[PDB]
Protein: Lipase B
Amino acid sequence: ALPSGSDPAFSQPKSVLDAGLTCQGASPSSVSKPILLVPGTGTTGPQSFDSNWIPLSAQLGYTPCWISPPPFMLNDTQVNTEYMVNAITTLYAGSGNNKLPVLTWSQGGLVAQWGLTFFPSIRSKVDRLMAFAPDYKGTVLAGPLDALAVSAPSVWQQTTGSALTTALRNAGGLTQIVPTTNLYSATDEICQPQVSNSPLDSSYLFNGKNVQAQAVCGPLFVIDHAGSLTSQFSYVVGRSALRSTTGQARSADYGITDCNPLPANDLTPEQKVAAAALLAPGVAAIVAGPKQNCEPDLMPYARPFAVGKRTCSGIVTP
Ligand SMILES: C[C@H](C(=O)N[C@H](C)c1ccccc1)c1ccccc1
Ligand SMILES: [Cl-]
Ligand SMILES: [Cl-]
Structure:
């Protein structure tokens, strides 16, 4: 079974977590049809989604809301998760105690599933999860942990073999917790392995709606890590997931004619340009950002699930 009982305490003050949450045109305590957007590594909320799911979710009738954990999602993924959990609590109450969808890119999906795994209170407040290129198993493209160059805290934790991904799995987090759709690509140049269309894939969750784009669009279809978020194909799948009565996208809602890898058709010209360039701010943030030679320690609520792994203060013990 999943962790149960009370939510772990936050390491950050509620006022600090509140400061990282924004909604377009409303206060979080009084917002109509919010959607919470959780960004990828090296970016803010606006940097991940200004060119795609902020205008697209508004056009679908949602008020776009987002978190921007500092610095640019490079800090401890466990802290980035505090921003999300607090945001869901606020937006749920602020919209009349109605569940809301969560839509994520890259690390953002790892953050969402970490939050659902270890903070039980939000399970009843997240209507559904729509994750684009989530790296629940991390990525093996960064190399093994013992050969990793100095890297940001969350980059360590997204490396396959990390204590964080170990703990997520052992606490039960590789199974969906709310109705979840995962859209990913075998041609992902950041997160691998993704080629099997099977539980080996880093984006796969048991009992979830697992959509490898090539399984629908064919082997020559090509979308990269950012294109998994921004493409017109991704929009049709995401639209299906957001509207489905089951909380998961449905194969009947999309098909081979939707297999367009370019930025979503409804985006403005300026937006399409920014969507193609989505990654560049992330790389600049990683050059200027924190770097260390070890993986951040697991917080107490997660430590018992990765006994034996090595973090900055040493080997995790029972
Ligand atoms: C931070 C890095 C990343 O997003 N890097 C950006 C996207 C990038 C793009 C092209 C080449 C190098 C890095 C990362 C690390 C582990 C797991 C997932 C992501
Ligand atoms: Cl398990
Ligand atoms: Cl099922």
